[PDB]
Design a binder for this molecule. Structure first.
Ligand SMILES: C[As](C)(=O)[O-]
Ligand SMILES: [Fe+3]
Ligand SMILES: [Zn+2]
Length: 440
């Protein structure tokens, strides 16, 4: 039985009040100038979705036009004023996508019209066109039939540039720790493993290599599902140790209060959090999440957000789009969220698909478009660790602190709890993975 305060689910144990972890005096932190900036945050800004699709198409059409190979772009509404002898390019939204034994049939839409696009079974770009999600913005080079079909010979994605200038080296080596899906309130929350991680952060390490990493750790990024929430799925009460949303954030803040003062924490919301029930999520609902807002070394970031650390762009998103990729693309699955994350980077959109459990807000501007090329992309949500480099961009899933729940077992989700990516800010790369799973 769920309860509501002003409409929101609030309720249906210890809150780590006693938890006190002090810094190890034996370890001295390396004195580095903290160079950080929230480069992008959601808060820095008839048909309900008309303005959103206009914004999405306009933004991604700009990214496609930056490809030197994309030329002779013509409006879809002008396609039969074009003779069948002229090779043209069209840019538009993938409205529909259907496979025949003879190839792929797309319904592509721009600001001027809609057209049926055919791509033959084995056009060298087929593998990519077979993977593209609907409501993504793509380009097609080909000829118009005059029967109503665009016979494409080439398919293009917004993508990331193959060549980008290397960044100047930093004065000192600085590390960033990536975590997500803590799920405080769940019986499956790896409580001891997380306490051992807080000890590790406070210089309580047993090797010299770890000691030189801990001394240089200045940033901690939390990519959503910081609490387990209330009424997220039917039967969730059976798994909750803390069945109160206020007490979940209070328990979380009591743990996060034990994060060293020299570490700047960037905390973003997820789908389990007391935040907007659609994406993008500006922040957390301050009425429920107040205890984390009061942490001295914490900065509440939006979902999505872009954090510039020492000149390196870290794009932080919860990871709702990984689900869209695994459902729509056969062959791609969890156990490896790295490849689905590459597809979102290539589409330059975090969650293009409409209709899923993935609620996309009918906002005026599409803030889910990856407008600028990041150095690192951090996502959570799927509860499986992975890391892959695509064209100099590090794609990384920060896993979870939650062991396999009853519900996860049923929907065949196999998590990799307590696996912590260690990021070298200079190269914006995962250099080590801390494994605290022995405590699970
Ligand atoms: C429990 As979940 C799959 O919403 O991180
Ligand atoms: Fe989660
Ligand atoms: Zn989630």
């Amino acid at each position: 039985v769920v309860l509501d305060k002003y409409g929101y689910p609030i309720l249906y144990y210890s809150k780590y009040e006693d938890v006190v972890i002090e810094w190890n005096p034996s370890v001295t932190p390396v004195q580095i100038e903290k160079n950080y900036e929230v480069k992008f945050d959601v808060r820095q800004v008839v048909e309900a979705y008309a303005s959103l699709f206009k914004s999405r198409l306009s933004k991604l059409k700009r990214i496609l036009r930056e490809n030197p190979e994309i030329s002779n772009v013509v409006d879809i509404g002008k396609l039969n004023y074009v003779s069948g002898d002229e090779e043209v390019t069209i840019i538009g939204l993938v409205n529909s996508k259907r496979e025949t034994n003879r190839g792929l049939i797309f319904e592509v839409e721009d600001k001027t019209g809609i057209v049926k696009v055919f791509l033959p079974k084995d056009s060298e770009d087929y593998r990519e066109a077979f993977k593209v999600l609907p409501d993504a913005v793509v380009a097609f080079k080909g000829f118009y039939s005059k029967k109503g079909i665009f016979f494409a010979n080439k398919f293009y994605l917004p993508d990331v540039p193959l060549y980008r200038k290397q960044k100047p080296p930093l004065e000192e080596k600085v590390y960033a720790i990536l975590i997500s899906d803590i799920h405080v309130g769940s019986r499956e929350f790896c409580e001891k493993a997380f306490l051992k991680f807080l000890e590790w952060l406070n210089g309580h390490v047993e090797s010299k290599e770890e000691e030189e990493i801990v001394s240089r750790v200045k940033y901690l990024i939390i990519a959503g599902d910081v609490v387990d929430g209330i009424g997220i799925y039917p039967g969730q009460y059976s798994d909750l140790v803390i069945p109160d949303i206020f007490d979940q954030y209070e328990a979380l803040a009591n743990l996060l209060a034990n994060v060293p003062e020299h570490i700047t924490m960037f905390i973003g919301p997820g789908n389990a959090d007391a935040a907007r029930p659609a994406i993008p999520q500006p922040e957390f609902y301050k009425e429920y999440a107040k205890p984390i807002y009061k942490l001295k070394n914490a900065i509440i970031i939006s979902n999505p957000a872009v954090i510039r650390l020492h000149g390196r762009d870290f794009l932080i998103a919860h990871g709702r789009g990984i689900e869209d990729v695994v459902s729509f693309v056969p062959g791609l699955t969890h156990h490896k969220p790295g490849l689905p994350m590459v597809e979102l980077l290539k589409m330059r959109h975090l969650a293009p698909t409409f209709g899923g459990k993935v609620p996309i807000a009918p906002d005026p501007e599409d803030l889910l478009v990856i407008e600028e090329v990041p150095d690192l992309v951090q996502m959570g949500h799927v509860h499986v660790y992975d890391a892959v480099v695509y064209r100099g961009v590090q794609l990384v899933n920060s896993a979870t602190w939650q062991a396999q729940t009853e519900f996860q077992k049923m929907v065949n989700i196999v998590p990799t709890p307590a696996k912590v990516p260690v990021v070298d800010v200079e190269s914006a790369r995962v250099v080590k993975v801390l494994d605290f799973s022995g405590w699970c």
